[PDB]
Design an enzyme around this catalytic site. Sequence first.
Site, PDB file in Angstrom:
ATOM      1  N   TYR C   5       0.835  -1.209   0.000  1.00 38.64           N
ATOM      2  CA  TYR C   5       0.000   0.000   0.000  1.00 38.64           C
ATOM      3  C   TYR C   5       0.863   1.249   0.000  1.00 38.64           C
ATOM      4  CZ  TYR C   5      -4.291  -2.609   1.292  1.00 38.64           C
ATOM      5  OH  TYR C   5      -5.372  -3.465   1.285  1.00 38.64           O
ATOM      6  N   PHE C   8       1.965   1.726  -3.605  1.00 41.47           N
ATOM      7  CA  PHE C   8       0.864   2.240  -4.413  1.00 41.47           C
ATOM      8  C   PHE C   8       0.538   3.710  -4.113  1.00 41.47           C
ATOM      9  CE2 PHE C   8      -1.317  -2.205  -4.566  1.00 41.47           C
ATOM     10  CZ  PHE C   8      -0.824  -2.473  -5.816  1.00 41.47           C
ATOM     11  N   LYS C  14      -1.006   9.160 -10.786  1.00 42.45           N
ATOM     12  CA  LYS C  14      -2.268   8.433 -10.707  1.00 42.45           C
ATOM     13  C   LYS C  14      -3.269   9.103  -9.786  1.00 42.45           C
ATOM     14  CE  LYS C  14      -1.976   5.040  -8.082  1.00 42.45           C
ATOM     15  NZ  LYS C  14      -1.862   3.813  -7.237  1.00 42.45           N
ATOM     16  N   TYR C  15      -2.801   9.679  -8.673  1.00 43.44           N
ATOM     17  CA  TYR C  15      -3.719  10.327  -7.740  1.00 43.44           C
ATOM     18  C   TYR C  15      -4.077  11.727  -8.222  1.00 43.44           C
ATOM     19  CZ  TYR C  15      -3.527   6.155  -5.007  1.00 43.44           C
ATOM     20  OH  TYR C  15      -3.626   4.845  -4.602  1.00 43.44           O
ATOM     21  N   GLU C  73     -13.389  -0.705   2.883  1.00 41.09           N
ATOM     22  CA  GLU C  73     -12.213  -1.576   2.744  1.00 41.09           C
ATOM     23  C   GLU C  73     -12.486  -2.928   3.428  1.00 41.09           C
ATOM     24  OE1 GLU C  73      -8.966  -1.617   0.848  1.00 41.09           O
ATOM     25  OE2 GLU C  73      -9.660  -3.534   1.674  1.00 41.09           O
ATOM     26  N   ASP C 100     -16.761  -5.960   2.772  1.00 41.80           N
ATOM     27  CA  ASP C 100     -16.535  -6.372   1.416  1.00 41.80           C
ATOM     28  C   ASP C 100     -17.598  -5.575   0.651  1.00 41.80           C
ATOM     29  OD1 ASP C 100     -17.667  -8.094  -0.894  1.00 41.80           O
ATOM     30  OD2 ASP C 100     -15.854  -9.230  -0.352  1.00 41.80           O
ATOM     31  N   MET C 101     -17.208  -4.804  -0.365  1.00 45.59           N
ATOM     32  CA  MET C 101     -18.151  -3.970  -1.119  1.00 45.59           C
ATOM     33  C   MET C 101     -19.380  -4.710  -1.745  1.00 45.59           C
ATOM     34  SD  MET C 101     -16.201  -3.053  -4.665  1.00 45.59           S
ATOM     35  CE  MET C 101     -14.576  -2.609  -3.869  1.00 45.59           C
ATOM     36  N   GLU C 116     -10.122   1.668  -7.386  1.00 44.06           N
ATOM     37  CA  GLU C 116      -8.833   1.417  -8.038  1.00 44.06           C
ATOM     38  C   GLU C 116      -8.575  -0.093  -8.231  1.00 44.06           C
ATOM     39  OE1 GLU C 116      -6.032   3.557  -5.594  1.00 44.06           O
ATOM     40  OE2 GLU C 116      -4.502   3.230  -7.155  1.00 44.06           O
ATOM     41  N   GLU C 125      -7.959  -8.190 -11.590  1.00 45.77           N
ATOM     42  CA  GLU C 125      -8.175  -8.226 -10.136  1.00 45.77           C
ATOM     43  C   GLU C 125      -9.691  -8.404  -9.801  1.00 45.77           C
ATOM     44  OE1 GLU C 125      -6.108  -4.941  -8.301  1.00 45.77           O
ATOM     45  OE2 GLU C 125      -4.153  -5.768  -8.896  1.00 45.77           O
TER      46      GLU C 125
HETATM   47  C1  ZR1 Z   1     -14.852  -7.176  -2.761  1.00 39.06           C
HETATM   48  C2  ZR1 Z   1     -13.973  -6.122  -2.153  1.00 39.06           C
HETATM   49  N1  ZR1 Z   1     -14.532  -5.343  -1.211  1.00 39.06           N
HETATM   50  C3  ZR1 Z   1     -13.781  -4.361  -0.695  1.00 39.06           C
HETATM   51  N2  ZR1 Z   1     -12.520  -4.034  -0.986  1.00 39.06           N
HETATM   52  C4  ZR1 Z   1     -11.985  -4.843  -1.911  1.00 39.06           C
HETATM   53  C5  ZR1 Z   1     -12.645  -5.900  -2.554  1.00 39.06           C
HETATM   54  C6  ZR1 Z   1     -11.696  -6.489  -3.460  1.00 39.06           C
HETATM   55  C7  ZR1 Z   1     -10.545  -5.776  -3.343  1.00 39.06           C
HETATM   56  N3  ZR1 Z   1     -10.701  -4.780  -2.379  1.00 39.06           N
HETATM   57  C8  ZR1 Z   1      -9.668  -3.806  -1.986  1.00 39.06           C
HETATM   58  C9  ZR1 Z   1      -9.195  -2.962  -3.166  1.00 39.06           C
HETATM   59  C10 ZR1 Z   1      -7.827  -2.425  -2.741  1.00 39.06           C
HETATM   60  O1  ZR1 Z   1      -6.971  -2.319  -3.911  1.00 39.06           O
HETATM   61  C11 ZR1 Z   1      -6.075  -1.288  -4.116  1.00 39.06           C
HETATM   62  C12 ZR1 Z   1      -5.856  -0.261  -3.217  1.00 39.06           C
HETATM   63  C13 ZR1 Z   1      -4.899   0.716  -3.484  1.00 39.06           C
HETATM   64  C14 ZR1 Z   1      -4.659   1.871  -2.500  1.00 39.06           C
HETATM   65  F1  ZR1 Z   1      -4.906   1.440  -1.234  1.00 39.06           F
HETATM   66  F2  ZR1 Z   1      -3.351   2.248  -2.497  1.00 39.06           F
HETATM   67  C15 ZR1 Z   1      -4.208   0.605  -4.712  1.00 39.06           C
HETATM   68  F3  ZR1 Z   1      -3.249   1.522  -4.946  1.00 39.06           F
HETATM   69  C16 ZR1 Z   1      -4.438  -0.379  -5.650  1.00 39.06           C
HETATM   70  C17 ZR1 Z   1      -5.375  -1.377  -5.333  1.00 39.06           C
HETATM   71  C18 ZR1 Z   1      -5.629  -2.552  -6.238  1.00 39.06           C
HETATM   72  N4  ZR1 Z   1      -5.148  -2.276  -7.673  1.00 39.06           N
HETATM   73  C19 ZR1 Z   1      -3.789  -1.672  -7.714  1.00 39.06           C
HETATM   74  C20 ZR1 Z   1      -3.768  -0.334  -7.012  1.00 39.06           C
HETATM   75  C21 ZR1 Z   1      -7.277  -3.393  -1.683  1.00 39.06           C
HETATM   76  O2  ZR1 Z   1      -7.007  -2.698  -0.472  1.00 39.06           O
HETATM   77  C22 ZR1 Z   1      -8.369  -4.467  -1.532  1.00 39.06           C
HETATM   78  O3  ZR1 Z   1      -8.420  -4.991  -0.207  1.00 39.06           O
END
Ligand code: ZR1
Lengths: 303, 307, 318, 318
Positions: C5, C8, C14-15, C73, C100-101, C116, C125
């Site tokens: 994280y 990223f 990107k931001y 999250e 979970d969304m 993202e 993903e």
């Molecule tokens: C079903 C469900 N419900 C709730 N959340 C969920 C899901 C599935 C995944 N996720 C989250 C998405 C998140 O993905 C990112 C966060 C950051 C940022 F935090 F920096 C990023 F830069 C990047 C990503 C991923 N692509 C590259 C860049 C990650 O934290 C997962 O746990």
Amino acid sequence: RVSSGRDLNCVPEIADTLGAVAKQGFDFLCMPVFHPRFKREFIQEPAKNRPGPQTRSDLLLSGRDWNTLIVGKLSPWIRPDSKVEKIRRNSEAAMLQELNFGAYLGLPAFLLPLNQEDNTNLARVLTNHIHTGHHSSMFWMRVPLVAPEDLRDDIIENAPTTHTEEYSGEEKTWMWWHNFRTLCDYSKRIAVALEIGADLPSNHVIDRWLGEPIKAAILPTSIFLTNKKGFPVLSKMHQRLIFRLLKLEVQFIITGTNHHSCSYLQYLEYLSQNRPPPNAYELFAKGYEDYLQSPLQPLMDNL
Amino acid sequence: PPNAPACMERQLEAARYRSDGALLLGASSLSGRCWAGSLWLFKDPCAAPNEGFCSAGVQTEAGVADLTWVGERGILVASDSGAVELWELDENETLIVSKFCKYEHDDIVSTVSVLSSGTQAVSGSKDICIKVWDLAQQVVLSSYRAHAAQVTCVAASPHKDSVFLSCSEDNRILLWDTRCPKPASQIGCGYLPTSLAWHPQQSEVFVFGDENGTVSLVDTKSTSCVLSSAVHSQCVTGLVFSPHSVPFLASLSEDCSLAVLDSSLSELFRSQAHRDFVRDATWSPLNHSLLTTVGWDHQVVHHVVPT
Amino acid sequence: ESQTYEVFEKDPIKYSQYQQAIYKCLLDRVPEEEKDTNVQVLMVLGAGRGPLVNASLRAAKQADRRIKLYAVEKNPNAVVTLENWQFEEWGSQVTVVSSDMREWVAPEKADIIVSELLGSFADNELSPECLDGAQHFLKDDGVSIPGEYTSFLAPISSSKLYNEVRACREKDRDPEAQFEMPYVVRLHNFHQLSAPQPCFTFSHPNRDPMIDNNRYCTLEFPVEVNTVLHGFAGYFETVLYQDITLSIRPETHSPGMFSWFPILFPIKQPITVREGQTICVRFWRCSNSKKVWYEWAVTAPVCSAIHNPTGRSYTIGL
Amino acid sequence: ESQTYEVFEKDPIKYSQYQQAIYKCLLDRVPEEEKDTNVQVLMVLGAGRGPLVNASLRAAKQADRRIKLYAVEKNPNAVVTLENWQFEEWGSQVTVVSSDMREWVAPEKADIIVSELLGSFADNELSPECLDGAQHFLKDDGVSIPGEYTSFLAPISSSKLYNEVRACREKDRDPEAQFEMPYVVRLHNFHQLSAPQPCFTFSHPNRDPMIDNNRYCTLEFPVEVNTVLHGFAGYFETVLYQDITLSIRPETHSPGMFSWFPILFPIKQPITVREGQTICVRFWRCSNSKKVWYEWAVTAPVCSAIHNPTGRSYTIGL
Ligand SMILES: Cc1ncnc2c1ccn2[C@@H]1C[C@H](Oc2cc(C(F)F)c(F)c3c2CNCC3)[C@@H](O)[C@H]1O
Ligand SMILES: Cc1ncnc2c1ccn2[C@@H]1C[C@H](Oc2cc(C(F)F)c(F)c3c2CNCC3)[C@@H](O)[C@H]1O
């Protein structure tokens, strides 16, 4: 000269604490990753839905510091082998939670205790976490040379401390460890943090830990005798055991509160400085220790 | 809002009413950046926990795991740092000043109890030791490693200064008496003992709560025919008797409830006002049917027990 | 992990791009006269340690509009960083949701859902699935950021990466499984045999019933040189909002963007390609209730075996 | 398969037992005066080619009561046999539903839900999960047949079955995986070292919130002889309705019943047991949203490794 670490169970401010620990001269800190007293609930309402953060933020330290200086400690209320079903279920969820949090930080090692004979469910939950995700963290079993029940003060009127030699009996902590690693399938990620008590046991009990993966030795402040000038020192018997551990190159851990006017560390450094010099063989083999090599075939092959 | 902190840490550990009716509050932050603790006095028990409507406040360098009144001015604190602390109110009771902070235990001081006289106290730690203290001399008189695990509860005798009860994760309930060479004795009688309460009238009868929510009545004389009731679903964190000549037993628990029981352990009151773990109970010295409970949810709930 | 994280987060381009996508959407949704009458429900889906939550606040200041932020999250370790930030800095503004969304029952619908959930091959993903299960809590006129994304594919030659994949054989599994799974790699010593072409595209919201995220695409790649094909580099493009976009397609690469590197989809046996020949590849996006995966095959100049049949070597978990 | 269902059908004892369980429940639910006022909603869950549907009709004739049958089956190949039977013979009486019993939205609630979702170790076909997701369509006073089921375990010695499991090594997998999975076997040349003891029990309906189908059980088995332990035979018992039961526990085996044979749960390394020693075994029922599995270990006289940690060798799909 000695890889030493401070063990704490009280960390009010992580940066202040680490700064003081390093000022003292330690190379690492063993600390709780959640508040040791913050018991959590995972199954029943309304404490299940306890709002607010669950611990302090990962942002409080550089990734480099979580990676090299912090050793996690499992919470003392977590008991996966409790006789109370609810406590096992709750403790399973809390142990996975705590372990997965340390993996999230890339901590180089996490500590778990072995203080009872039955640690079956604790082993199953550890084995399960090892098979879950991508982490590579070392697991340290805090196991004592002598069980707390066998070094207790003989002050219970109707329950006295036996004076009869129980050969196998006195080496019960080794079987706690042996069973735990047999359950965990001899994982290379599970090692020993051997806790050395006030008075050393029989030599045979100490010899049970020979050939075992001892990655750390835990020295409580309370096992240190005071010298004529007032600083902490160890008995010749305790000193002998330290010299065995230094050859094994273990990480010395100082646990407990202060009891002398750091000097506890400085004594280990002094002992480490006074050890005999390495002879020709010992100097040549320095690096080849327990490293498996193939036997040469100078007839079949050309050297 | 005196010369003290502006915020009181969410996890309210202990509630203690003194003789006049003033309320003592112990609090710790068991989450967030800082993991320190605080001590509060509320001359108005209805104003708690509001930080601006208090008589005095103070910041401890570490969490408050347990506390007890040392008379009317002093306060004895069980610290996470391994320290036993004594904090005394000033001449005007507008300040809370540190008298002694003694780091003698090797782990979190989990329980504290002041002895009948009030000159001595007993501490029980996670380091497995039990210690007898001299509040005036500021030293430890005796150090006892009688247990094989963490000490859950230490409870001084209501009237005898040399006698106290301890219980631990080693499944022992030890009756102590410093007048013997082997001071402790195992009370005979299952599940781990978690809370101890001496009966205020029968100096030979006491109650104990276990990790399985059960509350039990025990007589030191014939340690058989033990009376018990499944009061709670989760562990029993505390037991406090009412000031009544025929006392009422209030039992707090991790199931987030409070129950007030009679002499035959039957339930007379039940309170679900709490949303988090119920940490303490203190009956009013003034209104004996009015009982206070503080929880981990930051609530200070005042109950009117139907007597 | 915490350091994943952190990596990223350290991607300004990107931001600053996400900032603008929210900025331009805030202006299009609330007119200057409605500046204080309407507060916009903004929902970050997959918030991590909250870099988008901060970008949403930076977008609300420059667009000078009111927003009501939610930070959904599922990673509870990340959720600790969010809840510490909420207490110490964000406040009542941001409502941190540890769910979970696709399971979260929301209080009210969202004006804008911002996510993202994109990998090196865009939908790899499972962004299609995640935002589909979140689509029920978006207003019947709400905006999803990103609104669209497209995966690209180009044939490659690298006897060096073909060897690197051969070296990936592990015990207790198929001796050839390493050729039936994608890899994220900063492709260097390689040769691109044909220009990237679009493969799979997903748009959000997907108002169509029988939505279906499965795909089957056939690509025909003209080759000008004599060569040996070893695999297929995959890249992606995404439309955040209107003209604001992010890309990892080399011919439209967003300058200075670090978060993504190309994917590589190898083939078991290398294929000789003569000058003037066409490389034809077939790609599939597959799935059941529990897993999503890719299957693929070369059909010209010669056939290959179908790679990863039934996710047998590699699936992406739901 | 069609022949698997044919084999399960040719078990009279089991169906004459199910007949009686419905018969006795029909009498207990509808009194002779209410004989024609009340028609009972009967729902077969996991109907196959309908042997229980027929048993339910045979039970309605002898109990002389009215029933409204539903035949829920997810296997659509089986569903063809059901729909042909419905047309040619059953009629309006039976409403064939081609669904998964956890996805089916039923018209009205059921008076009795009847199911055969039991394996050799009772809950090993995921009967707990299936009937939990079906429990919402059972009347707040409805009867489930079976009402209860219990798995049993006994320690065994057979150097012949230990070798038979060693011979089960396959390529492209763990060389020791064959020791971390149960097998259905008609145990013959073996020795039972201790009497069967109950392991896991499930009751339906499960009116309790936080129901949890996961389990952890510790068994202590007294051994009178000197021996070598190789594994654990598993059997089951089930309470269909009241005194009507089925069992595969050898000391209570339902005479002439063919549908089930014992399970065998092996251990990697054989264990020496001396006369008078106690064999202690630990069993776990585990699960995530997608899979259910068993994990197990011997803790006395000596420890074994934990077998099948995280279903790594064998899981049962949800
Ligand atoms: C079903 C469900 N419900 C709730 N959340 C969920 C899901 C599935 C995944 N996720 C989250 C998405 C998140 O993905 C990112 C966060 C950051 C940022 F935090 F920096 C990023 F830069 C990047 C990503 C991923 N692509 C590259 C860049 C990650 O934290 C997962 O746990
Ligand atoms: C979630 C869900 N929803 C709807 N149906 C579902 C499921 C899960 C399974 N099933 C059904 C159950 C049925 O199982 C049997 C049928 C017959 C009879 F047909 F002979 C049997 F004898 C036996 C069994 C199984 N235990 C041994 C004896 C099989 O057809 C499956 O497809």
